[PDB]
Amino acid sequence: TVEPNLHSLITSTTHKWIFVGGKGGVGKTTSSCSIAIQMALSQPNKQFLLISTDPAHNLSDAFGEKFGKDARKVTGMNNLSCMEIDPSAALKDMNDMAGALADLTGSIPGIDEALSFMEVMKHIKRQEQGEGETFDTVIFDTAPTGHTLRFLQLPNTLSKLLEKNELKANVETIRQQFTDPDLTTFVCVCISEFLSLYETERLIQELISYDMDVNSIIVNQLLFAENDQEHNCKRCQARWKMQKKYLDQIDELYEDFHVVKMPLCAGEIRGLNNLTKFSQFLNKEYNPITDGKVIYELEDKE
């Protein structure tokens, strides 16, 4: 079978572009974080960047450190650096320094998406040049709502009507890297609940249509109430039954997938230390029996 973790990705050296996405409050950010950390530790030789466009600006909250426009090394790490950036503000400034543009642009899908994206890229490059240091792999903390990457269809719709450039040529450059499974992949975050799962398939399908590799689902907030020594809450037990019920469905539906079943750490995970402690279970799958204390110790501090 396929392994129930992300070990093969964390260790991979071929990937430049790893996207983490998940709609609706399912762990997305600490997932982005956890992956980034694991990769960095597993590959001390490389330079990693966690970039986030999420408007909630919560890499800063996760790390309890204040990141921003300027790529900065995560404190207490020597190969992980983070930037939080709002692309609208970046795109808007470009329009500024530069209503008729909206009749043609505003309407077309992926146009504003692509412009916005290109802008981010440009910004990254500027970071490397000035620093004199370059990154080997970026990890995108995608925004929880929208279609950041629906601009990966532009090159198709723009050649069609061209018979009827700078941009379309950029996009085809990008799309070439993003279609290479060894170069770039997507990691879906979700929770074992119908509505989230549904949204998750929708996403997978959409990525597949863009010809983006998607091989990995992270399933957060699992309870494992059977293997719990408090065996306390009759309510959480009853919840665990739902969660379980769908795991079984997920299992027979994304067989060739790496579906990682992460545990629920009650409350919140913040700071490098705990984020780290916790991100280990993306590599070597969590086991309620032996790994329990690790979680009960993260919570009891909280």
Partner: protein
């Protein structure tokens, strides 16, 4: 004319709103964020009605032409 002038204004206000909403956290601001979305689905209606009226202010002007020459 005044119809194109407005269509552009709508198409522009709608756009500006879109980008503003893209800077709000839908999970941390569900009410505000949901409101702005409701305003967008409105503007899309207004803008698709203006667009339909203009297309039909062509059919209205255009009928005043074929009426001229070949009504003769």
């Amino acid at each position: 004319n005044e119809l194109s002038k407005k269509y552009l204004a709508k198409v522009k206000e709608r756009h500006e709103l879109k980008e503003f909403n893209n800077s709000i956290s839908a999970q941390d601001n569900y009410a505000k964020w949901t409101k702005n979305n409701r305003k967008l689905d409105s503007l899309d209606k207004e803008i698709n009605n203006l667009k339909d009226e203009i297309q039909s202010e062509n059919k209205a002007f255009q009928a005043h032409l074929h009426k001229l020459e070949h009504h003769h």
